[PDB]
Structures are given as structure tokens and as C-alpha cells.
């Protein structure tokens with residue numbers, strides 16, 4: 001009944017190399033972009049949540065909240081200037097997901113990341129669910145207008161510290177990211193219902209699984225589907241405690257005596273992906289891909 005012969009990266013690589021493993025879903029968060037120079041949200045001291053006091057918020061989550069944004073957008077746009085990536089070079093982890101695409105194993109990448117690195121690494125719109133939107137485009141917030149603006153326009157407003165107003169109607173222009181309180185893209189639900197029927201392997205990388213409904217995705221997979229977490233620390237566990245994110249019952253079981261399908265490889269995402277690629281015979285392909293794409297970016 002158990003699909004992994006052993007609860008290890010080697011077990012997952014052998015499963016991946018079997019014919020049952022045809023459809024892989026990746027679930028990724030900010031941890032897969034930290035080696036690209038983009039700090040994450042919840043790491044102590046460097047993460048965003050430990051760097052909010054200077055914005056003088058009524059509480060730290062306000063800067064994520066759509067109703068607060070609509071009333072006082074200036075903190076969000078000051079933060080956006082502070083965190084604007086100085087360069088957009090995707091990581092080994094991103095290019096591993098690109099290799100999964102090129103080899104026909106990637107059914108979908110569900111990303112929480114707003115930095116657009118998945119696109120730059122070559123995942124196309126069909127391969128991707130940007131579950132929490134991206135900074136790539138922005139829209140006027142007036143339902144009667146909804147004029148679109150490209151990242152170059154938004155970037156100029158952010159760096160000039162001018163609050164972005166729509167050129168046609170002078171309402172606020174918001175990046176197409178999903179704030180706390182907003183609905184997720186409809187693509188998220190349509191793809192979820194189709195993808196999680198088919199998935200043979202769930203790859204979870206670089207996320208604390210602290211945000212719903214995205215974190216519910218790990219429970220949408222069939223109960224035999226193996227789940228591999230590559231992350232600096234365990235996350236999404238089912239162990240109940242007050243303030244757990246997971247609905248009760250759902251969650252990962254790495255360590256109980258009933259554990260049967262969940263693997264935690266604890267370390268840096270780039271190293272874990274390099275180790276998995278090596279076990280699969282993809283290490284040189286992945287290394288060459290990173291080198292070539294990185295040089296291509298370095299030229300301009």
C-alpha cells in the first residue's frame with residue numbers, strides 16, 4: 001500500500017524513476033528565493049516580519065491587509081521600495097522546476113512568491129498558478145476602470161516614492177498580488193480541482209505553510225501520494241496546537257510510527273534540489289541550465 005520504499009530522498013528519487021510517477025506538483029514559497037538575494041518573511045532578524053516596526057503600523061499584519069492598504073497605502077509602497085529586488089536571477093531550485101517542466105514531469109507549480117522568478121526561469125503561464133499573484137502587473141482598483149500597468153511603470157512610482165494613481169481615473173493602482181482579505185485567482189480553484197486528482201508526487205519547498213487556503217493544498221492530494229518537503233525546517237505538520245494553521249486532521253507526518261509517505265529533507269533548497277537532481281542523473285543538465293541562464297541574464 002506504501003509507494004515509497006523508504007522515507008528518504010533516495011526513496012523519492014527511485015519512486016520518481018518508476019512509471020507510477022508521471023505528474024509532479026510543486027508548492028513553493030519565499031525560501032526558494034532567498035539564495036537569489038530576496039529575504040523571506042518569517043526568518044528571524046532578516047525576514048520581513050522582524051523588520052516592520054519602523055513603518056509604525058497599528059499591527060504588523062496591517063501592511064498585508066487590503067482594507068488597510070486602501071485607507072493608508074503609503075506604508076506598503078515604502079516597504080515595496082525597501083524590498084525591491086536589486087536583481088532577478090532565479091535559483092537552482094527554480095531551474096530544477098524548469099527541468100521538471102522540460103522533462104514532462106511538472107503538472108503544476110503552485111507558488112506563493114510574488115517576485116516573478118518562476119517566470120524568468122522559464123515556467124510558462126500554463127505551468128504556473130501564481131496563487132498569491134505577482135508584482136509583474138498592477139491594476140487600478142476602481143471596478144469601473146481596472147486599467148492595467150506594467151512593472152516598469154510601478155517600479156518608477158515605487159522608487160520615486162509617489163503613491164501610484166491611475167492615469168485615467170486617479171484611483172489607487174495596486175500590484176496584482178493577493179492581499180490578506182482578497183479572493184485568490186479563479187485559476188487557483190479550477191487548477192486545484194483538476195491537478196490534485198492526477199498528482200503522483202508533491203514537492204514542497206521553501207515555505208512555512210502559514211497562509212490559507214494555500215496551505216490546505218497539501219491535504220488535497222490523494223492519501224497515497226508521497227510528499228517531499230525541502231526546507232530549512234519542518235513545516236505543515238499535523239501535530240495539533242493552539243494557533244496551528246492547518247485544519248485539524250490535515251498536515252504532514254514525518255516522524256510518528258504511522259508515517260508512511262512524507263519525507264523532510266532539511267537544509268537549503270538549492271542543495272536539496274542539487275542532491276535530488278544528482279540522484280536522478282540530472283546534475284549536469286541542471287548545472288548547465290543554471291550556468292547558461294545566469295550568464296544570459298548577466299549579459300544585460
Ligand SMILES: Cc1cc(C)nc(SCC(=O)Nc2ncc(Cc3cccc(OCc4cnnn4[C@H]4O[C@H](COP(=O)(O)OP(=O)(O)OC[C@H]5O[C@@H](n6cnc7c(N)ncnc76)[C@H](O)[C@@H]5O)[C@@H](O)[C@H]4O)c3)s2)n1
Nearest residue numbers: 029030031040041042112115132135206207208232268269
Ligand atoms: C518584482 C518585485 C517587486 C517588489 C517590490 N518585490 C518583489 S519580491 C520582494 C518583496 O517581499 N516585496 C514585498 N513588497 C510588499 C510586500 C508586502 C505584501 C503585502 C501583501 C501581500 C504580499 O504578498 C502576498 C502574500 C499575502 N499573504 N502572504 N503573502 C506572502 O507572504 C507569504 C510568505 O510565506 P512563505 O512560506 O512564502 O515564506 P516564509 O513564511 O518566510 O517561510 C519561508 C520558509 O523557507 C525557509 N527557508 C528560507 N530560506 C531557505 C533556503 N534557502 N532553503 C531552504 N529553506 C529556506 C524558512 O525557514 C521558512 O520555512 C506568502 O504566502 C507570500 O505570498 C506582500 S512584500 N518583487
Ligand SMILES: [Zn+2]
Nearest residue numbers: 140145166169
Ligand atoms: Zn482607473
